[PDB]
Design a binder for these strands. Structure first.
Ligand SMILES: [Mg+2]
Ligand SMILES: [Mg+2]
Ligand SMILES: [Mg+2]
Ligand SMILES: [Mg+2]
Ligand SMILES: [Mg+2]
Ligand SMILES: [Mg+2]
Ligand SMILES: [Mg+2]
Ligand SMILES: [Mg+2]
Ligand SMILES: [Mg+2]
Ligand SMILES: [Mg+2]
Ligand SMILES: [Mg+2]
Ligand SMILES: [Mg+2]
Ligand SMILES: [Mg+2]
Ligand SMILES: [Mg+2]
Ligand SMILES: [Mg+2]
Ligand SMILES: [Mg+2]
Ligand SMILES: [Mg+2]
Ligand SMILES: [Mg+2]
Ligand SMILES: [Mg+2]
Ligand SMILES: [Mg+2]
Lengths: 195, 109, 129, 153, 98
RNA sequence: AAAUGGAUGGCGCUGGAGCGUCGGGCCCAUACCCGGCCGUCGCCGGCCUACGCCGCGACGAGUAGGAGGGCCGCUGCGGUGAGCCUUGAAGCCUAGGGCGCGGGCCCGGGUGGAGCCGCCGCAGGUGCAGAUCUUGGUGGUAGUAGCAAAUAUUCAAACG
RNA sequence: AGGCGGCCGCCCCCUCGCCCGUCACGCACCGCACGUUCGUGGGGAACCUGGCGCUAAACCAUUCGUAGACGACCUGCUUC
């Protein structure tokens, strides 16, 4: 009943629009690994845009004003909130369906991740265009947990490597068993109706 | 046993930008994402099923907390497989983003 | 076992709500009765969207079902037994309604006469102990 | 006479009333709302402690510019006071309630204040001499009080 | 905060910190927690807690309290405070603390 | 290059969600077409309250202003209802039922305790949301400001 | 931001739990809806029964002043 969408390789707005449209329908969406979301344009251009956004702030009381977030997950959350009607009760109720998270936590490392090809940088941008990584962009402005994020990502990748090796061994054994039991299993129906 | 209806979500009523029409509702049925695929669901009955605190009589069995609003598919909507519907009574605004089961009672093929 | 009227169609109402006077909710000195707003810059007079509705001739109900009760009869007010026998020929479409100032002693006589004449009464078995 | 929220068991209930008595209606309302739903002994003890400033009466509805006390934490509120005149008036009313219960033959120990209502009274007037030779009203706010006592067990 | 392991015998001078009213209280703090150091099963549980901390925890801090008895003040309530240990290895910092 | 932080409407968009030329679909106005209902006008139809009863067609916005209808409402008078009422009049209240597009009205229930209303005409000191409107009453402010010009009170007892 | 899954040794037992064929039965409700599901769903007040364990802490009052406009905050009480 949930949609676990990977974050790496997807464009910021191209993915956020799809998530904002899918949340208003009722599907609970969880965007994992938000530090890999790419943004079109020059990295210095995106940095200048983010700094111009940071400059905007209430004069009389900055604490009671625009709350600028530094984590890339919170950046993506604010981007989706900018498209959702958050000032109405429908948008307020839909905002809990979206779960933006940095890294791949225990509740989501075992779940298979989905990829939306309509937001992938490979098909969205030309191979000669410049892009900026949201993780580096956030780390350059008031983000401190990039090192531990990368360390935990390395750990979970080294674990998933062994898991995939085990799965590949199981697949090899399955293919060997299929090739071994040739008799007693005709299954001409499977071939005539093509699996 | 097993489900005998298609799944559809209520996105909103038929509306422009600064006005709504509560008599006609829009449905996003799962599996249909094109205009050439919604011709099968034209005329199919639809049911918005919810629960209340006072049990009401049911056609089969003892009274239950279940209450259903009936309607049917009128025509298609757009090119993205969205469909239209008109119920006996207009859908409540709280049903936006919830499920209306599309039956297969009126069968043509 | 109520008295069956003549044939009756499904009465449809153009508007089921009663028209509310403008700004009658903010001030309790303003009665619920409708008054035509004649302001030079009022929203209701020029019919802005989202405002209250103004009653016009368009909301007029059908002449075939006008003044018809949900039971299917048309009420006629009576005071004594003399003004009850006049509804003898119109018992199938018109029905009787006893006045409010009629005493309980003279009300039961009207009820008995209506039951004898087979005339529908909108307020039967009223003010009984 | 006429009472609001008459008791369902008139044989196990006793009523008390005071009319046109000179206290502040607001302080009387606060102390009555604080004392409602309490046994007679506990109510007497609480009023005797309020008179000596041992535990505040929380001002919830009429609390404009009311200084906060430390003893109001028991009521989950921050603003409390010690209205002595209303305390002694409600004590005098509870005495008449106990007397009526004894006359009716009820158990005083099991009596609880299930209902107590206070409302405004006709205001008496005086005049105040202000600047530039102006006269302003100086009005009192007396209140009518009523209470019903019923045995809990 | 991953885990916290307290000592076996905690003096009342330090236990006074966990109470707002020391006179009305019954001094029942850490009565059942001290039984873990006496029970062999509790000792095994504390040892597995230490073993899990050695592997998972990265920043080690030590909780210490002052001795108001030696001071001329009449407070008698010790101030508990955490001090981060900046030793070489996380595995040896736990040994140095234990 | 301009002074509060900030405006392709915002989010955002770069194999386009930008610019130029275009194609096929799709979205909706009180606009158009079909149909129901209400009113006006025109043409009328019948020897069924003729001031009534039908039929067809076309049109309905509107300040200032001009007309027509009201079986909308208030008071009093002349007729009339063999009118209603101490087995309960007027008045007041009501999560009750219901009518009229509307002004308003009918009934049920609870108070109330002595008059009232329908129809046909007549005459008005006849309909209120305002006028720094008149009189009377009541709220927020608010148990707030304020009980501070001229040195100062304390102990014990009695009547209560 | 961890708790379900795998392995091995037994436990009350088990070779119609799977695919094809075969004789015979059952709410065959007489054309109809809200049917079938993670529901031993979440939350709150109690009722009858078994086994294992628990016997407090806050606020008020009082005191302190490292703090106080009032609240608040820093402190003490033991019969040695
Ligand atoms: Mg900072
Ligand atoms: Mg104008
Ligand atoms: Mg205020
Ligand atoms: Mg004050
Ligand atoms: Mg002040
Ligand atoms: Mg003077
Ligand atoms: Mg911009
Ligand atoms: Mg037109
Ligand atoms: Mg016009
Ligand atoms: Mg009249
Ligand atoms: Mg009476
Ligand atoms: Mg009299
Ligand atoms: Mg006048
Ligand atoms: Mg007025
Ligand atoms: Mg004025
Ligand atoms: Mg007067
Ligand atoms: Mg005033
Ligand atoms: Mg003051
Ligand atoms: Mg003076
Ligand atoms: Mg004396």
């Amino acid at each position: 009943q949930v949609l676990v969408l990977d974050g790496r390789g997807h464009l910021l707005g191209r993915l956020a629009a799809i998530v904002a449209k899918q949340v208003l329908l009722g599907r609970k969406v969880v965007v994992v690994r938000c530090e890999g979301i790419n943004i079109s344009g020059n990295f210095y251009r995106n940095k200048l845009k983010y700094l111009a956004f940071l400059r905007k702030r209430m004069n009389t009381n900055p604490s009671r004003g625009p709350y600028h977030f530094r984590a890339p997950s919170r950046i993506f959350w604010r981007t989706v909130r900018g498209m959702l009607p958050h000032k109405t009760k429908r948008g307020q109720a839909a905002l809990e369906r979206l779960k933006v998270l940095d890294g791949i936590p225990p509740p989501y490392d075992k779940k298979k991740r989905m990829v939306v090809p309509a937001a992938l940088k490979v098909v969205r941008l030309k191979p000669t265009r410049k892009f900026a990584y949201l993780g580096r962009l956030a780390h350059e402005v008031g983000w401190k947990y990039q090192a531990v994020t990368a360390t935990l990502e390395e750990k979970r990748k080294e674990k998933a490597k062994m898991h995939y090796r085990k799965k590949k061994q199981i697949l090899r054994l399955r293919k060997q068993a299929e090739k071994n039991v040739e008799k007693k299993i005709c299954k001409f129906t499977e071939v005539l109706k093509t699996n | 046993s097993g489900r005998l209806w298609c799944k559809a979500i209520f996105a909103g009523y038929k509306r422009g930008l600064r006005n709504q029409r509560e008599h006609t509702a829009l449905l996003k049925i799962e599996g249909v994402y094109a205009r050439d695929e919604t011709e099968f669901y034209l005329g199919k009955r639809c049911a918005y099923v919810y629960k209340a605190k006072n049990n009401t009589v049911t056609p089969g069995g003892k009274p239950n907390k279940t209450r259903v609003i009936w309607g049917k598919v009128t025509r298609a909507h757009g090119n993205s497989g969205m469909v239209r519907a008109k119920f006996r009574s207009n859908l409540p605004a709280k049903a936006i983003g919830h499920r209306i089961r599309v039956m297969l009672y009126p069968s043509r093929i | 076992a109520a008295l069956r009227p003549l044939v009756k169609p499904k009465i449809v109402k153009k508007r089921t709500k009663k028209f509310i006077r403008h700004q009658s909710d903010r001030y309790v000195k303003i009665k619920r009765n409708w008054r035509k707003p004649r302001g030079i810059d009022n929203r209701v007079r020029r019919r802005f969207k989202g405002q209250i509705l103004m009653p016009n001739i368009g909301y007029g109900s059908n002449k075939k079902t006008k003044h018809m009760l949900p039971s299917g009869f048309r009420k006629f007010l009576v005071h004594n037994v003399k003004e009850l026998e006049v509804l003898l020929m119109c018992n199938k479409s018109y029905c009787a309604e006893i006045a409010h100032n009629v005493s309980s002693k003279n009300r039961k006589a009207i009820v008995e006469r209506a039951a004898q004449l087979a005339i529908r009464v909108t307020n039967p078995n009223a003010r009984l102990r | 006479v006429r009472y609001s929220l008459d008791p369902e068991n008139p044989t196990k209930s006793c009523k008390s009333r005071g009319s046109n008595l000179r206290v502040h209606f607001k302080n009387t309302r606060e102390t009555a709302q604080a004392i409602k739903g309490m046994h007679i002994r506990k109510a007497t003890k609480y009023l005797k402690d309020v008179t000596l400033k041992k535990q505040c009466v929380p001002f919830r509805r009429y609390n404009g510019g009311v200084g906060r006390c430390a003893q109001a934490k028991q009521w989950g509120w921050t603003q409390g006071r010690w209205p002595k005149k209303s305390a002694e008036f409600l004590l005098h009313m509870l005495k008449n309630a106990e007397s009526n219960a004894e006359l009716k033959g009820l158990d005083v120990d099991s009596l609880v204040i299930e209902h107590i209502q206070v409302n405004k009274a006709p205001k008496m007037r005086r005049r105040t001499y202000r600047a530039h030779g102006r006269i302003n009203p100086y009005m009192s706010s007396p209140c009518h009080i009523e209470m019903i006592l019923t045995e809990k067990e | 905060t991953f885990k916290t392991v307290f000592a076996e015998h905690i003096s009342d001078e330090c236990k006074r910190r966990f109470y707002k009213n020391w006179h009305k209280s019954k001094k029942k703090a850490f009565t059942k927690y001290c039984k873990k150091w006496q029970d062999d099963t509790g000792k095994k549980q504390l040892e597995k807690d230490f073993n899990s901390m050695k592997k998972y925890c990265q920043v080690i801090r030590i909780i210490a309290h002052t001795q108001m008895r030696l001071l001329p003040l009449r407070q008698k309530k010790a101030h508990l405070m955490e001090i981060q240990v900046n030793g070489g290895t996380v595995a040896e910092k736990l040994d140095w603390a234990r």
